Structure formats: structure tokens, C-alpha cells
Design an enzyme around this catalytic site. Sequence first.
Site, PDB file in Angstrom:
ATOM      1  N   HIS A 154    -151.500 114.525 -67.679  1.00 27.28           N
ATOM      2  CA  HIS A 154    -151.275 113.289 -66.934  1.00 27.28           C
ATOM      3  C   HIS A 154    -150.451 112.272 -67.726  1.00 27.28           C
ATOM      4  CE1 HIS A 154    -155.167 114.545 -64.698  1.00 27.28           C
ATOM      5  NE2 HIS A 154    -154.116 114.968 -64.020  1.00 27.28           N
TER       6      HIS A 154
ATOM      7  N   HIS B  12    -155.628  73.812 -62.160  1.00 25.43           N
ATOM      8  CA  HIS B  12    -156.717  74.579 -61.597  1.00 25.43           C
ATOM      9  C   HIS B  12    -156.163  75.529 -60.555  1.00 25.43           C
ATOM     10  CE1 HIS B  12    -161.046  75.011 -60.587  1.00 25.43           C
ATOM     11  NE2 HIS B  12    -160.642  75.142 -59.335  1.00 25.43           N
TER      12      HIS B  12
ATOM     13  N   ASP C 260    -163.310  62.897 -64.059  1.00 23.73           N
ATOM     14  CA  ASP C 260    -162.173  63.175 -63.168  1.00 23.73           C
ATOM     15  C   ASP C 260    -162.385  62.525 -61.792  1.00 23.73           C
ATOM     16  OD1 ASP C 260    -159.801  64.126 -62.186  1.00 23.73           O
ATOM     17  OD2 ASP C 260    -160.489  66.175 -61.783  1.00 23.73           O
TER      18      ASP C 260
ATOM     19  N   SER D 133    -157.035  63.418 -60.095  1.00 22.76           N
ATOM     20  CA  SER D 133    -156.641  64.751 -59.621  1.00 22.76           C
ATOM     21  C   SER D 133    -156.524  64.771 -58.127  1.00 22.76           C
ATOM     22  CB  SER D 133    -157.658  65.814 -60.029  1.00 22.76           C
ATOM     23  OG  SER D 133    -157.797  65.857 -61.435  1.00 22.76           O
TER      24      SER D 133
HETATM   25 CO   LIG Z   1    -161.742  75.577 -57.414  1.00 23.55          CO
HETATM   26 MG   LIG Z   2    -159.749  69.274 -63.704  1.00 23.08          MG
END
Ligand SMILES: [Co+2]
Ligand SMILES: [Mg+2]
Lengths: 359, 364
Positions: free
Chosen positions: A285, A188, A100, A129
Site C-alpha cells: 500500500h 473565534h 469582553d 466583540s
Molecule cells: Co462559539
Molecule cells: Mg473572545
Amino acid sequence: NPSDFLSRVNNFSIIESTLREGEQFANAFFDTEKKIQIAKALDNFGVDYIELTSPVASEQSRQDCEAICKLGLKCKILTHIRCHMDDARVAVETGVDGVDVVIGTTYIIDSATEVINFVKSKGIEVRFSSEDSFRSDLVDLLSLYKAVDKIGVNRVGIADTVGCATPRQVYDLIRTLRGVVSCDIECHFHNDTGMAIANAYCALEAGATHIDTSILGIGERNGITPLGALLARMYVTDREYITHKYKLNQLRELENLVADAVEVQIPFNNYITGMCAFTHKAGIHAKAILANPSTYEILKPEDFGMSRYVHVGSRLTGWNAIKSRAEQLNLHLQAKELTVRIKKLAMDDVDRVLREYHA
Amino acid sequence: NPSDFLSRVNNFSIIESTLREGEQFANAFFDTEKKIQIAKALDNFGVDYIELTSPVASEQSRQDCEAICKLGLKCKILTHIRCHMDDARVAVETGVDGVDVVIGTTYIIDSATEVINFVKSKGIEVRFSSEDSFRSDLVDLLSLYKAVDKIGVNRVGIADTVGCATPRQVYDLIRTLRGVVSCDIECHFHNDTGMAIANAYCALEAGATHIDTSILGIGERNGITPLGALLARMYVTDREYITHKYKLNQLRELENLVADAVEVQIPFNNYITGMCAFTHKAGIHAKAILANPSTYEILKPEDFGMSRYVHVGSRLTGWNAIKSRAEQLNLHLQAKELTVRIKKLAVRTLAMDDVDRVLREYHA
Ligand SMILES: [Co+2]
Ligand SMILES: [Mg+2]
Ligand SMILES: [Co+2]
Ligand SMILES: [Mg+2]
């Protein structure tokens, strides 16, 4: 709805990042041997990719990267680099299946072109990225992905490095990216505001193909999309796909392996494997809702290696607590010095004390 | 952009449900005294409502409801009932500010009408809610809310009782409901699939006005939208609104109060207040990203009563661990008492989450 055609909710890959993102966990200091145990267990579990800390990070990272690539694992081994030729030269010689190229937001495009074409020339998968994608200029970001797509790259990556992105914002961005590039999309998500799983879900709905996870979500700050939590969500969406792709009954042992190494407890509320995940309140409950508690069982304990929901009527104390949890976990027990340990010692202690034992 | 006009992300109310949903937590057995401590601390913290377990549930529930209403709290006290007259009669006499009539999916509308009009005739706020809203027939649900809106209620309620709803589905439903009814909208989200906070967020974007939370998310199964996690999210959206509406520096003590009562640890990854929430990795591991770790600080420690992010370069063991956390928390240290209880945990191998556990006894 035409847009459902693009959804990847039952057709995606996990990039497991316990050995990249996870190394940023406050208490993670994995040695070669532990990384190797983790990589093997993750491969056995069924993740398609494992990502490793850049071999440029340190002499030990280079060695561990190389050692992990010599294991003959089924999953692909990935790493990442800066947009720089010397970094790329190191990464390619390590044996990794994928590299990457990461940038943070002109001369980017020409430099990235050199790096991308070099990696492709080695027969290695290349990805491009952006870091902190949601605090970057949108048009500049999209224009950069567009150009990198024309160069030819295997995947592009989006990252909410800061934890500020919201689900609909994620959906909208990934859906635009899906219309801009012709390649796969990796994602991510940081969990600072509680969005990491939701953001992953919406990314997949929008056409993303690869999601980063971490065991117990461990990482920088409060970490990223947790592995178990993603699978619980994806399991509700498509039970048959998830149960057959992953060895879900190995999830507790996988988490226990990491929890021991980074010296943490398994949180009581932890998705699937927490103490209270498969519990119902029985008694007065339960009248806080209208239907019988057992009406609400989106997760089936047996799909995850467990035996039942525990129906709690009164406080479980002593060996009653131990026995109830041990039986729910299908541990067959040893029973002597657990109740003797628990007395000279809380609720999460039950799981703490049971960690050694296997089903 | 026109949709932004309906968004309630910086203008909403929290219905705190530690004393209703929270009672469904596997290890919650609050006595009157503990409930009263929790109610008082919630009121000081600044939530607009607290909801209590139906006074119909048991004799002690009836008594605790009455006792909590006699406290003179600023927040309004809410409870809920079945769509039944006997329940309504009990609830109204307790002193509560508001009653939720709950149904689960023509005789519904007739029964509901009687109960709603009874509650309204007592000067008490009335709300009408469905249980397991996201596994119900949409058209029937929307038709029911439409009818109940015409009778006149203060609020309608939507509940993802099972934990299956996804954020965009929540947005879509709430946004439709906002065009169907003219009243306020209260929401309730379970966390089985990790969506409870996202779902609350999107509900507010879509026009919902009231969100249920519980302290540490405690509830049935893995619980609901956590109080602290909602506020972290809402804080990032509008810092000035959240920091001035709530006493955010009290959040740790509020959680510690509940954690002691239900006998759990504060999870290391817990939003804001977990061991690792305000930490960066320093060292070669930081090269897993491009920028300096301190570039990524969406939450400011000082807003939450803390002093800094801890930059971890090497394993923090022993008194170094305690000192680091204690100073991050602004505890002023007593280090002879904390030396006397880790010497009693030699009893077993000691580990990261115990730092916060031994520090629980201490105030900033
Ligand atoms: Co991170
Ligand atoms: Mg990645
Ligand atoms: Co609930
Ligand atoms: Mg409600």
C-alpha cells in the site's frame, strides 16, 4: 513582502475556551471541581488566558468564576458579558483580569461607552466583540470597531459564530481591521465547514494576536479551533517557539481529562494524539506514493512526548496492538488485564483502554 | 472580482481515493469484495472518478483494478503509475479510463514524453503529477508542468504529500499554475496541520478542477481531505449544486461501510454525521453566546437525511440517548435488540460515542 511584518504566527496568545465554548458541548456538565482541574492543567500547559462562561449565566457560574480567580494561576482569567451595566457590575466583582463586552449586529456606541469606561475604571482589561461577524454588515462593523478604538479598549474581537467563513475572507477582514484599530485583536472560529484551524492561521498571518481554542475543539455543534490542532499547525510554522512556550508532552493528558469528563473517545484521526496521527503504512500500500513513507514526517513524535511513527505492515491484533501503542506513548507497563479486557470487547478501543496510564 | 471568473467552487469533480489513499490507512486491508462494495457505493453516491492503487503494486492490486473496471460503473476509474514504461504497459491493459504519471522533485521530460504519448496512443486519459509539490523548487516544478502541457496531457496534479501547505500558499500556487497550463488541474491535500479542507477550498477558488477525497479522510498518517467535510463546505458555498449532484442522504451509510471495514468509530465531532454535528446546547450554557442557538444552522439536517438539531438541556443517558439519536437519523425502530446489546455493555462502562456505534447496524 511588507505584509509579513504584521504576521503574528510566531507571536500570539491562546485564549483557552474549554470553560466557556466547551460548556456548550452537547455532553459537557462540568462541576466546580472539574473546572478547577481543567483550569490548573491549562495553566500548567502554558496558555496565556482562560475564558469562563459569564458569571451572569447562573448562580453556579458566578461561584465558579470567583473560585477560579482565587487559584493564583499564572494565566489571566477572562469572562464575557452582554453590553449592559448590571452584567458589568457582576463581572468586575468576581476577580477576573478581563471582561469582553459582546454585541450582535448608534445607541450601541453610547451604551458600550458606559460599559467600557466602567470596566476600565475598575482597573480591569476590557474587550469589545461582535457575534457572527461574517454575516454582519461590513461597513457598520468596521465603523463600530473604529469608534470603540477611540474610546480606548484593550482588544477587539471577531467571531465566526456560524462556521461559514473561508480563509481568504478571514485574512482580508483581519487585515482591514488591523488598519482600522490600534489595539490587539481576538478571534473565534467555528468548525462546521472544516475551516476553524485554517481561519485561525490566516487571522494570525493578518495580524490577529489572540486565538480562541477548545480542548478537542469541543463546543456548540462540532465546536471551534481545537487546541492541539492549532499547536500542530503553529509548530510546523515555528517549532522553537511552540515547543518552548507550551508543554506539548502534557497534551494527551489534557485531552484525556476532558474526554473522560464529556464521555467521548479520542478520534483515530485526531491531530497529534489520535491513534493514526503518527502512523505510516508499510507494505504494498506504500507504493501509492513514490518516496519512502518516513520522508513525510512534518511532526516529530518526540516533540509531543511520543517515541516513533508506527510502521504498519499487517493488522495489529490483541496485545500486539496494545504494546505497540503503549510503547509509542512512552507508557511503562499492569500489562496483564489490558489484553484480557481487549479480547472481551475495534481500533479506538486501544486508546480507550490505555487512557488511565501516564508516561 | 475578475478572479471569481476562474473559481471552480460550484463546478468541480471529486476524485474519490478511498481505494488508493485509503489503502494507506493504518488499519485498511480491503479484500476484492470490500473494494467492489465501496466502488459501487461511491458510484451511486455520485462521485465522477474513483482512483485505485497502482496495478503494479502487487498481483492482487492488478486483479482488483481489472475487476473494478468490469463493473460498468458510471464514474471513471483512474489509477497512477511511476514515470516508467513497464508500469504504463501494465496500467493500460487493465481497462482503466485514466492513468496518472507521477514524478517527485531534462531526462524527466524525455521519459515523461514517452510514457505520456504511449498512454494517449491507447485512447486512455493521461495526467501528470508531482509528489510533495510544496517542498519542491517552484521554478522547476512550473517549468515541468509547462513542458508537459505542450506535449499534451488531460490534467496536471499538485499534491501536498507532507501536510505543510497553508491555504493562501495553495491559492497562490494553483492560480499561477492556472496561468501556466491550459489543461485541468487535480489536487491532493494531507491533513497533518488541519488544512486539508481549507486547502481544497482555496484550490477550487484558484481554478483547480479535481479534488482528491477519502471517506472519513482515511489515509497515510491522519489522512487527506474527507469526503463529507468537503461536501459540507461546498454545500454552504452552493447548496443547490451539491444537493443535486450527490446523494447526501447516503453519506452515513457510505462512512459506516468504511468504518466497519477499517474498524474505527465515527468521531463525535465528524462533519455532518458525527454525534454532535447537529446539536445545540440548551440551558444556562447557551448564554455563552447572545442569540438563540438555532440562529446558527449553516447546515440543514434535512439536506443530509436527518430530521433536526438536537437541543441538549441535560445529560441524555440510557434509552433516551438512543431514541434521540435514532430519530435524528430517521431510523424507524428492534428496540428489543438494542436493549440486548447495551445489557452486554454494562462488559464495561458505556459512553457517548457508543450511541452511534450500536446504531450502525440500522438503516433509514
Ligand atoms: Co462559539
Ligand atoms: Mg473572545
Ligand atoms: Co496522499
Ligand atoms: Mg491525483
